[PDB]
């Protein structure tokens, strides 16, 4: 179906955008992209960001603790799937440029379930991330 | 032409699928997105997998020899090509996470050639690999 | 709309078919992928090559100043925007395979503007590169 094809080049456009405004420290623009009951999973075993002023307020107490940086969100090996609601599974690759060089990693399998909003426009209704480096600890 | 749009998300979206299978261990579930017949030539110097069975099982000696880790396949630039067969040319960043840290590499220029199966759904025929570190070794 | 979702797989399937030419050395194929007055500003600080010649004459100076390797530009996180010519932003991530190893670096945010050919396929009209290392130096 040219609609499933359509589906899946809005869902690569929607994720660019919201890390595009992520990686730039736009943090307020990132958690309008959620809806505002979103739920943001950053990080195993610390509780969900619920709502986007807890986006907002999260991100900001995280970059207070760290960071003269500049970090780039990379996804890949999108999957998606089901009447409007959609699901997508992907990988993520973190990568941050320090003075002091480049830094590669974590990888993070990613689980986002995404809703379209009054306007038409797809909103993150839920992160849901997971750090490969807390998978292989054991 | 809208339908040579969709075909690009759909190998895309197989592509996703088959390495969600194959990073999470799920051996049978890759082989099972291969015709019956395909041919998986991952190592360069090293005679292809040809059927599923052979792939599970190529899989599964290569495990035995190499794995406490977890490994990620990125493909990116993918660039599709031609009245049923479908020629796929992309690149496949390897990442290995392991309790000592994140491995990068290598990288491999990939072609993949897919048809349909008989309910429709996409099936690799072939994949053939070769690494950029070979390639430079001469 | 299903011509929105074909025009981003067109500038995918175009991206990757000029990172392919220029990473495997096709430096007049990879100009042919430009406009004849086309605009390529790879490196901060350095003025940009205009017109497909000084695009392969800029190749060729830079090639002799630094190559036994192979590189491999990945792009990620593409969106992209608005009768006639589209701007495409995105992330490059550079790997240069080496007889010693790989690296991974650097990063670097893309604005690329399309327009279409006289044959109704994409050339790249501008290309403007920014790298992460730069923007991080201050």
Redesign the interface.
Same mark, same amino acid.
């Given at each position: 179906?040219? $609609? &499933?094809?359509?589906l899946?080049?809005?869902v #690569? &456009?929607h #994720?660019?955008?919201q890390?595009?405004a992520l990686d730039e420290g736009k943090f307020e623009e990132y958690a309008d992209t959620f809806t505002p009951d979103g739920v943001f999973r950053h990080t195993p075993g610390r509780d969900p960001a619920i709502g986007r002023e807890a986006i907002v307020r999260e991100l900001n107490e995280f970059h207070e603790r760290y960071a003269?940086? &500049?970090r780039?969100?990379?996804?890949?090996?999108?999957?998606?799937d089901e009447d409007s609601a959609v699901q997508a599974?992907?990988?993520t690759?973190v990568?941050t440029?320090?003075?002091d060089?480049?830094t590669?990693?974590? $990888?993070c399998?990613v689980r986002d379930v995404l809703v379209r909003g009054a306007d038409g426009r797809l909103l993150t209704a839920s992160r849901w991330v997971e750090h490969?480096?807390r998978?292989?600890?054991?």
């Open positions: 179906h040219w $609609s &499933q094809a359509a899946y080049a809005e #690569q &456009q #994720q660019a955008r890390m595009h003269p940086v &500049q780039r969100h990379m996804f890949t090996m999108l999957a998606i599974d992907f990988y690759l990568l440029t320090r003075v060089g480049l590669v990693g974590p $990888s399998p490969d480096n998978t292989v600890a054991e």
